[PDB]
A paper describes a structure:
To elucidate the structural basis for the NAD+ hydrolysis by the tube-activated DSR2, we incubated the substrate (1 mM NAD+) with DSR2H171A–tube complex, which was obtained by co-expression the catalytically inactive DSR2H171A mutant and tail tube proteins together in the same bacterial cells. We then determined the cryo-EM structure of the DSR2H171A–tube–NAD+ complex at 3.0-Å resolution, in which approximately 60% density was observed, facilitating the accurate tracing of the NAD+ substrates. In addition to the presence of four distinct densities corresponding to NAD+ within the Sir2 domains, we also observed four densities corresponding to the tail tube protein bound to each CTD of tetrameric DSR2 in a DSR2: tube ratio of 4:4, which is distinct from the 4:2 ratio observed for the DSR2-tube complex, indicating variability in tube binding ratio. We observed large conformational changes in the CTD by superimposing the DSR2–tube complex and the DSR2H171A–tube-NAD+ complex, likely due to their different tube binding ratios. We speculated that this variation in binding ratio can be attributed to the different purification methods we used.
The recently identified bacterial Sir2 domain-containing protein, defense-associated sirtuin 2 (DSR2), recognizes the phage tail tube and depletes NAD+ to abort phage propagation, which is counteracted by the phage-encoded DSR anti-defense 1 (DSAD1), but their molecular mechanisms remain unclear. DSR2 forms a tetramer with its C-terminal sensor domains (CTDs) in two distinct conformations: CTDclosed or CTDopen. Monomeric, rather than oligomeric, tail tube proteins preferentially bind to CTDclosed and activate Sir2 for NAD+ hydrolysis.
Author numbering:
A (entry chain H): 8 to 36, 41 to 42, 48 to 77, 170 to 177, 191 to 211, 214 to 236
B (entry chain C): 336 to 365, 369 to 399, 406 to 634, 644 to 786, 789 to 897, 903 to 1005
C (entry chain D): 336 to 365, 369 to 399, 406 to 463, 467 to 633, 644 to 897, 903 to 1005
D (entry chain G): 8 to 42, 48 to 77, 170 to 176, 191 to 211, 214 to 236
């Protein structure tokens, strides 16, 4: 029952704010040398009640998100553009985004206590 | 309600009390010459109808869907659209096909024109269906516009505006205060008494009957699978499949746009993925003391109406590798067609956004499920070329696209043409690297493509990347350390040239050198670098606690465990996180902090060494028994039978 | 549709394009003096109604069901019935109550009178729905009693007079259920729009569809392992469940007692327990408990097979069982009702069909509650003496009793009830035709074993008296009390053993079970070998496999060295689970069945593990079963002794 | 699709005929703790059967105003108890499905017989 802020990574402007609904962090394992601890880790986040920033809406016509409960920060969040229409009209927009990781930084999410 | 009709093709007696008409009708179907000539011709017409729709006989004693929209013949529908319609009947399917290709404005206008021209229609069925499809197009346009003003800004970056403002204004205007629940009631009473069975089509929720029936059938199937009972007559699973195929054929053959809405996709994904679970339970069923295979149609259904996360969930729930795959040639043709469309669109000026949202969601599922089907070399070349170059990167990033590629690689070992295609992709990525970063949601960057290439050749040398390395200069850092991760692909001269400027400054370069295989044992310099980074990590640690997924710390702990590190300074760094104290000093780990999810990440060698510790085996065996008894992941259990860690 | 009202009670602005009346109303609710006096008088009633139902506050900023029908107060409803109805609403309350305790005839008549006497207008609508539903109940009850009633009860009942059936057929004909809302005044249709869904013959389809979507979402979270932070789909499921229960039961609708609503409950419930149990099996990476209302829900809307499947799927004995006193008085009411019914003058058959499934489910699933000695005693007395024989057989009623025994250890009072139940069973074992048959396969000897297991020194006075009374004439009592030998006194033991001889195989099994045989005398070897000779002779182009399960016992005895005569190998080849124990080396385990491993106990399983010449095949079987299946008992066998 | 024949145990009279839909055969041990000595091989053998379309014999109906079942490989249950649970649908109803559970006599101690 916390709040999530979607911000532009470069400018820092708040793209939108919403309430978190669902988060999946599932990391699992063809792919003698030094053990490198290779892993395939992903984070998906479904968020609810998102109303976009009015200034950003006026401007629009990389992202980073901060989910604050203790204190979580996801850098490089890519919003999945899946769109499906219900025959029943529409009720709030739900935004799905996946956590991206840079090769050099090699970090996916940060938790602050 | 005089008779009751099962999906099998048999009729059952409930309510008609007078003389039985179909009883005599079926026996007449099985001396019919005594009827009149007009009786004979209408009986011919009925016979054609009833055997067309599958009503074969009564109870006492596969499907095909003939539609271009279901098969994704996305050029044949275009050819149909360009052709002039002789009759309004051909104009209905043209409007449906126009709808299927985005282009919802033209579909709406054509549906309105069919409505205008349906004044002289004999029955009015086409008029009512056109009205339903026009409302479906209207809500489709409304939701798409809402998305483009919403999600269409986050995604795509820009504002698209596929429908003009005047067009939106007029369609909001004529659609104002339009109640579909009244649409069937607002029809001539002849139409209502004749087309009574289209009434369920009217309401804004028409699949609730089907969804409820599927809920009941799914509950019954789950009850049988929990009890272990054996169905002898028509199994409830077979009933699910029959009502399935009946529904797909009804809403695809009759050209309804409602097939493309979220409710129908949900109905499909719940009706499907339950036959699969029932099949897997049937396979894994013990013998007592007293198979189902998917076809091209099922492949299309899963490719279209299943989301990537939902296919992931179903493959997690049940194993699919033991389900045999038939009609593989048709599946290959469908996949090659999908790849051809995405190439012909993105490769040439991009593709229209309205058709993009409809196409790409099912394209994900098709290419993801393509792992399981066996494909020819030409088909694999086409689909790999489509997925690498001409697929929109905004959805499947480098890491997830690599997972896609290795999935299509599982069934068919990599041929030389596919490796050439991946070499071209890697060359393109190399020339992409500017202040450009290869970010990925999956963490499997471009080096994994080269790793796959070397895994399937072990002697492949990429010529163009070698020449790029030869022309590399010290000014350009991103390309140099990008090709450093692609070291095994380069030639010997390229390796020597790249090693001139390549230095292990930070430990990330050390990881890259290890992965490429440049480092096989730790020199004192590498050990000193590791210790220095650990020093600064603790220095910054001491002051709230912060946990990151950098995971290098656990890698250092594992290196200490496998004796690859032989310097006794590691114990000073104990306490800054878990999974490091687990390996360095396993006896003093206080396993109340142990996380069972760790064992999945480790490989055969690591967990084999962990098995041989025997001063640490029992705590992890307790964790493993708890997980196996509690969870149904079946990977922890597989670990358990493998080596009982 | 101007506002979205959901289960939690928070109003959401959905399609209101004008001024916001809900936001301002809630601001006023949370300066009402400035309101007009008549307006404020209306506002107080609006406050009362909006807080009685939910609707707590804005979106940006426990259940109680009060009805004598839901709680099963089958005596209080009667007392309400004979009271004269003051008004039509109390009369409709009495209509629902009259429909609850069977007696569809009087409830139908009362509904008809309420229909004529109604001239709000909603009472007529609800009464029309309930009268149609009551006619449907009478019609399908007539069909069941005509068709299946004869086979089930053994006799034709005809609870309803033929004239009544003719009159109701005539009156309900030409009554279209879907029409009944359309053919009512425009004022009512405008005001009472929310009741439109009740008009149609199928009104749970929307609720069932929403429940399907929510259950699918919950299953997706379960399989994926995702974490839900806000209002979860599970709490939505349970809260919508409670909304439906409090809307259907409180508004006096018989549509609650149908298969559709029962099955809707059975989906919405038992999906909460599955998710709660999986929550305990949550994988830690970098609770839900059951109340009296839940107990009533499972006792009402779950078939015995359904709760059995729920037990198979999830360990239901770990979930906390709160509000235990309310539960206990609930089953006390059930027990007193069944005793009052079946103690004197048969039963009310229309009441019987509706109530016996609930009684069976409650008494079965009572394993997980702690009942006091008095309540447990009355429950056991209702379960054994007064529960109908047709529904609960000896073995299955015994299973019910031993499941009640789980949470509460047997007291002396309950042992007395078991004792005189056994005495009554011995009394019934006089005619040679009578023999207690059980679907479970367990019998009164199991009651005796239960008593001995919980006391180990009990001596049954009345059965010992009958044993001292036994003569050679009544063989049925002789070989019934043979199975109850440990309960008998030593004088009774000698008196029974005077006429008791091991004549056949079943007699030897009874003697072993009671404990008379501790080592096989050579006469027992002769008898077993002769029976195997007879089995081989009758074996020697069709083959029989029965569920006698004697050959397996002989094979296991040979395996555990209990039988030390090497003539068994001659009988090798007829049936399996015999060669597996006699000569495991040449068993050709392609015919081995994993389910046999379920039937073994700790000693047998340990010996099988210690054989070491048949260990590898069986470890492979256990491994492939634990990989293939989710039974979780094969894994327990696989890890307790690593067999 | 295979049929079942219902007989009275006393005589050869046909009670009803039907077609078997599902048969639940789930038999295992009882509770281990509650039930050195010679092994008895305890069991909790249960067999349940359901039939989809059953029409009762007209002579049986006429006479009505312990059972055997013969499921045709052919199998026989010498004693079957029909679980007469009547649950009613608000949809008008129709498929009369009859569920019965096999029983084992104390002397015989056999529940079902399967014969080619």
């Amino acid at each position: 029952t916390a709040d999530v802020y979607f911000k532009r990574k470069s400018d820092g402007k708040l793209v939108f704010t919403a309430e978190a609904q669902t988060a999946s962090f599932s990391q699992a394992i063809l792919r003698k040398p030094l053990y490198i601890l290779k892993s395939e880790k992903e984070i998906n986040l479904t968020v609810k009640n998102a109303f976009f920033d009015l200034e950003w809406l006026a401007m629009t016509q990389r992202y980073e998100v901060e989910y604050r409960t203790i204190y979580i920060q996801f850098p490089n969040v890519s919003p999945s553009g899946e769109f499906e229409m219900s025959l029943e009209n529409g009720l709030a927009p739900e935004i799905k985004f996946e956590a991206l990781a840079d090769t050099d930084t090699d970090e996916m999410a940060v938790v602050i206590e | 309600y005089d008779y009751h009709f099962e999906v099998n093709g048999t009729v059952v007696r409930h309510k008609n009390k007078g003389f039985g008409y179909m009883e005599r009708f079926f026996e007449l179907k099985e001396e019919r010459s005594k009827l009149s000539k007009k009786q004979y011709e209408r009986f011919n017409a009925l016979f054609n109808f009833f055997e067309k729709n599958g009503v074969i006989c009564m109870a006492k004693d596969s499907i095909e869907i003939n539609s271009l929209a279901y098969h994704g013949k996305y050029d044949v529908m275009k050819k149909f659209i360009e052709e002039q319609s002789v009759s309004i009947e051909d104009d209905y399917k043209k409007a449906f096909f126009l709808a299927c290709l985005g282009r919802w404005e033209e579909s709406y206008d054509l549906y309105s024109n069919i409505i205008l021209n349906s004044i002289d229609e004999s029955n009015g069925c086409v008029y009512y269906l056109s009205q339903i499809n026009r409302y479906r197009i209207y809500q489709s346009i409304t939701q798409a516009v809402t998305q483009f003003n919403g999600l269409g800004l986050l995604t795509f970056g820009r504002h698209y505006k596929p429908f003009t403002d005047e067009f939106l204004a007029r369609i909001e205007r004529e659609m104002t205060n339009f109640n579909i629940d009244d649409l069937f009631n607002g029809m001539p009473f002849e139409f209502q008494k004749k087309y009574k069975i289209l009434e369920f089509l009217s309401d804004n929720q028409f699949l609730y009957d089907d969804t409820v029936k599927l809920f009941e059938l799914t509950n019954k199937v789950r009850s049988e699978m929990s009890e272990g009972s054996y169905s002898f007559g028509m199994s409830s699973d077979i009933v699910v499949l029959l009502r399935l195929y009946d529904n797909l054929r009804f809403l695809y053959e009759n050209c309804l746009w409602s097939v493309s809405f979220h409710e129908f996709h949900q109905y499909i994904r719940n009706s499907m993925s339950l036959l699969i679970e029932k099949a897997e339970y049937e396979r894994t069923r013990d013998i007592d003391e007293l198979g189902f295979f998917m076809e091209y149609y099922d492949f299309v259904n899963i490719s279209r109406h299943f989301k990537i996360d939902d296919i992931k969930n179903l493959e997690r729930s049940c194993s699919i590798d033991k389900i045999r795959f038939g009609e593989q040639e048709k599946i290959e043709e469908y996949l090659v067609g999908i790849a051809e469309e995405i190439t012909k669109q993105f490769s040439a000026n991009g593709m229209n956004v309205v058709f993009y949202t409809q196409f790409i969601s099912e394209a994900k599922a098709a290419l993801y499920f393509a792992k399981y089907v066996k494909l020819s070399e030409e088909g694999l070349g086409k689909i790999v070329k489509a997925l690498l170059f001409y697929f929109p990167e905004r959805d499947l990033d480098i890491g997830k696209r690599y997972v896609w590629l290795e999935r299509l690689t599982k069934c068919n070992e990599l041929p030389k043409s596919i490796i050439s295609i991946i070499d071209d992709f890697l060359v393109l990525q190399a020339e992409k690297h500017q202040n450009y970063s290869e970010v990925s949601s999956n963490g499997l960057y471009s080096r994994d493509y080269g790793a796959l290439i070397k895994h399937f050749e072990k002697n492949f040398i990429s010529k163009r990347l070698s020449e790029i390395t030869l022309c590399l200069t010290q000014d350009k850092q991103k390309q140099i350390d990008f090709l450093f991760k692609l070291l095994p692909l380069l030639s010997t001269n390229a390796k020597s040239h790249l090693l001139s400027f390549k230095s292990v400054e930070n430990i990330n370069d050390l990881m890259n050198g290890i992965r490429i295989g440049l480092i096989d044992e730790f020199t004192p310099e590498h050990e000193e670098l590791i210790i220095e980074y650990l020093e600064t990590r603790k220095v910054n640690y001491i002051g709230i606690q912060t946990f990151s997924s950098n995971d290098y710390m656990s890698t250092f702990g594992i290196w200490y465990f496998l004796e690859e590190i032989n310097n006794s300074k590691m114990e000073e760094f104990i306490g800054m996180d878990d999974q490091y104290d687990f390996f360095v000093d396993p006896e003093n780990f206080d396993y109340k902090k142990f996380i069972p999810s760790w064992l999945k990440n480790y490989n055969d060698k690591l967990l084999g060494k962990i098995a041989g510790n025997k001063h640490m085996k029992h705590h992890v065996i307790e964790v493993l028994k708890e997980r196996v008894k509690n969870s149904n992941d079946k990977r922890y259990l597989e670990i358990l039978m493998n080596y009982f860690i | 549709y101007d506002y979205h009202f959901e289960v939690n009670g928070t109003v959401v602005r959905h399609k209101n394009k004008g001024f916001g009346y809900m936001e301002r109303f809630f601001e006023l609710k949370e300066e009402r003096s400035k309101l007009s006096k008549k307006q404020y008088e209306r506002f107080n009633a609006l406050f009362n109604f909006f807080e009685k139902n939910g609707v707590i506050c804005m979106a940006k900023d426990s259940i109680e069901i009060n009805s004598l029908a839901y709680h099963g107060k089958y005596d209080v409803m009667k007392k309400f019935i004979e009271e004269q109805s003051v008004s039509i609403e109390d009369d409709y309350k009495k209509a629902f109550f009259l429909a609850c305790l069977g007696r569809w005839e009087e409830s139908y008549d009362l509904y008809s009178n309420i229909i004529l006497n109604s001239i709000n207008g909603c009472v007529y609508y609800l009464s029309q729905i309930n009268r149609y539903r009551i006619y449907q109940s009478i019609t399908q009850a007539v069909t069941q009693f005509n068709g299946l009633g004869l086979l089930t009860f053994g006799r034709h009942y005809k609870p309803f007079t033929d004239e009544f059936l003719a009159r109701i057929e005539r009156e309900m004909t030409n009554f279209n259920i879907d029409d009944l809302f359309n053919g009512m005044p425009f004022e009512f249709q405008k005001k009472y729009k929310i009741l439109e869904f009740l008009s149609d013959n199928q009104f749970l389809y929307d609720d069932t569809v929403k429940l399907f979507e929510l259950t699918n979402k919950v299953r997706s979270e379960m399989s994926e392992g995702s974490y839900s932070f806000g209002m979860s789909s599970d709490i939505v499921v349970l809260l919508r469940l409670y909304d439906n229960l409090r809307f259907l039961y409180e508004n006096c609708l018989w549509s609650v007692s149908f298969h559709e609503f029962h099955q809707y409950i059975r989906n919405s419930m038992s999906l909460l327990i599955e998710k709660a149990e999986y929550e305990r099996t949550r994988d830690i990476d970098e609770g839900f408990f059951m109340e009296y209302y839940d107990f009533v829900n499972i006792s009402r809307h779950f078939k015995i097979d359904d709760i059995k499947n729920l037990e198979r799927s999830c360990s239901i004995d770990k979930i906390r069982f709160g509000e235990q006193e309310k539960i206990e008085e609930y089953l006390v009411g059930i027990a007193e009702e069944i005793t009052k019914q079946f103690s004197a003058n048969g039963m009310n058959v229309v009441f019987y069909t509706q109530f016996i499934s609930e009684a069976k489910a409650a008494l079965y699933f009572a394993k997980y509650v702690k009942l006091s000695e008095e309540g447990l005693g009355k429950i056991v007395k209702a379960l054994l003496f007064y529960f109908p024989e047709r529904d609960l057989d000896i073995g299955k009623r015994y299973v019910w009793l031993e499941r009640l025994t789980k949470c509460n250890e047997l007291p002396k009072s309950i042992i007395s009830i078991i004792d005189d139940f056994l005495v009554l069973q011995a009394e019934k074992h006089i005619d040679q035709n009578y023999s207690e048959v059980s679907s479970n396969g367990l019998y009164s000897r199991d009651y005796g074993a239960l008593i001995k297991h919980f006391e180990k020194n009990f001596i049954s006075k009345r059965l010992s008296e009958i044993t001292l009374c036994l003569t050679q004439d009544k063989q049925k009592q002789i070989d019934f009390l043979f199975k109850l030998l440990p309960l008998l006194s030593t004088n009774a033991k000698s008196h029974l053993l005077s006429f008791k001889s091991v004549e056949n195989i079943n007699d030897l099994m009874n003697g072993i079970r009671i404990g008379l045989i501790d080592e096989f005398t050579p006469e027992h070897e002769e008898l077993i070998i002769e029976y195997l000779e007879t089995r081989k002779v009758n074996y020697i182009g069709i083959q029989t496999f029965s569920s006698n399960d004697y050959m397996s016992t002989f094979g296991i005895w040979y395996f555990l060295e209990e039988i030390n005569n090497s003539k068994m190998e001659e009988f090798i080849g007829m049936d399996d689970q015999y060669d597996f124990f006699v000569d495991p080396e040449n068993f050709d385990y392609k015919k081995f069945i994993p389910s046999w491993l379920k039937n073994y106990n700790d000693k047998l399983l340990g010996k099988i593990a210690g054989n070491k010449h048949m260990k590898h095949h069986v470890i492979e079987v256990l491994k492939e079963r634990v990989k293939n299946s989710n039974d979780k008992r094969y894994l327990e066998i696989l890890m307790n002794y690593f067999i």
